[PDB]
Amino acid sequence: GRFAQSQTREDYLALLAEDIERDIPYDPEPIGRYNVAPGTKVLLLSERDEHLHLDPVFWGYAPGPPLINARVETAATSRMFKPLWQHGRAICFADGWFEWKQPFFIYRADGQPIFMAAIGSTPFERGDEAEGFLIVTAAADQGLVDIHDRRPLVLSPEAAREWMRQEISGKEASEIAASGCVPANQFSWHPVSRAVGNVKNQGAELIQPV
């Protein structure tokens, strides 16, 4: 599991929320992460107290090496994940994600951010070291099948906002996940350097065609 989250907070928030619906202090500095790895703290978007918040949350979830993904096919009915599907929905924004067929970087053709569905342990603001978030995954569709069998569940801006709502049930979230998934025809992709494999590599070049 690996993705890029390189731009500024405002770059990611433009499609999701007007200024007054956010409690996300202004910071003009790019997040600047070209190679986001599991087991690190990642800026995670969620809704509480009627506002969007951005909290640094552990990418991983360990029961009693940590899990990093939750399959959409089973998460909502999972004995482990069903409560998180109900109460711990979030969004992890990104520029695109990496997968290894030879690594590829996958991103929206229109250049807009991807809003990846996530589930995790609320309250997110507690900075838990073990009970963090997971990225929800789906089966690869269309051209993506030739790269890998899985992909992140990516939601449209409308669906991402709905997904995060505390007034939305697990059942409603399952409907939103189905109808709001961004299909593969909306993405482009290209091979990138093999350097992305080593997490010590963090340069801007990692997302460029090779």
Swiss-Prot record:
- State how changing residue 137 to A affects the protein, per the record: Reduced formation of the DNA-protein cross-link. Abolished binding to single-stranded DNA
Q: Which GO terms describe its biological process?
A: DNA damage response; protein-DNA covalent cross-linking repair; proteolysis; SOS response
Q: Does the keyword Lyase apply?
A: yes
Q: What is the effect of changing residue 99 to Q?
A: Strongly impaired activity
Q: Which residues are marked as site: Required for sensing abasic sites? A: 99
Task: For this UniProt record, give its keywords in alphabetical order, as a comma-separated list.
Answer: Covalent protein-DNA linkage, DNA damage, DNA-binding, Hydrolase, Lyase, Protease, SOS response
Q: Which domain of life is it from?
A: Bacteria
EC number(s) on record?
Answer: 4.-.-.-, 3.4.-.-
The reported result of mutating residue 79 to A is: Strongly reduced binding to single-stranded DNA
Q: Which Pfam families match?
A: SRAP (PF02586)
Q: Which GO terms describe its molecular function?
A: peptidase activity; protein-DNA covalent cross-linking activity; single-stranded DNA binding
Give the matching SUPFAM superfamilies.
Answer: BB1717-like
Residues with site note (Required to stabilize abasic sites): 148
InterPro entries hit by this protein: SRAP, SRAP-like
Q: What is the effect of changing residue 100 to A?
A: Reduced binding to single-stranded DNA
Query: Where in the sequence is the active site?
Result: 99
Reported regulation of activity = Formation and reversal of DNA-protein cross-link depends on DNA context. Catalyzes formation of the thiazolidine linkage in presence of abasic sites in single-stranded DNA. Mediates the reversal of the thiazolidine cross-link in presence of double stranded DNA.
Q: Does the keyword Hydrolase apply?
A: yes
Q: What does this protein do?
A: Sensor of abasic sites in single-stranded DNA (ssDNA) required to preserve genome integrity by promoting error-free repair of abasic sites. Recognizes and binds abasic sites in ssDNA at replication forks and chemically modifies the lesion by forming a covalent cross-link with DNA: forms a stable thiazolidine linkage between a ring-opened abasic site and the alpha-amino and sulfhydryl substituents of its N-terminal catalytic cysteine residue.
Question: What family name appears in the similarity comment?
Answer: Belongs to the SOS response-associated peptidase family.
| Miscellaneous notes | The abasic site sugar moiety is in equilibrium between its cyclic furanose and open-chain aldehyde forms. The O4' rotates to a new position and interacts with the His-148 side chain.
Entry comment, domain topic: Glu-99 catalyzes reversal of the thiazolidine linkage; self-reversal is favoured by duplex DNA formation. Glu-99 is also involved in sensing abasic sites in single-stranded DNA (ssDNA). His-148 stabilizes the abasic sites by forming a hydrogen bond with the O4' hydroxyl group.
Q: What is this protein called?
A: Abasic site processing protein YedK
What lineage does the source organism belong to? Answer: Bacteria, Pseudomonadati, Pseudomonadota, Gammaproteobacteria, Enterobacterales
Q: Which gene encodes it?
A: yedK
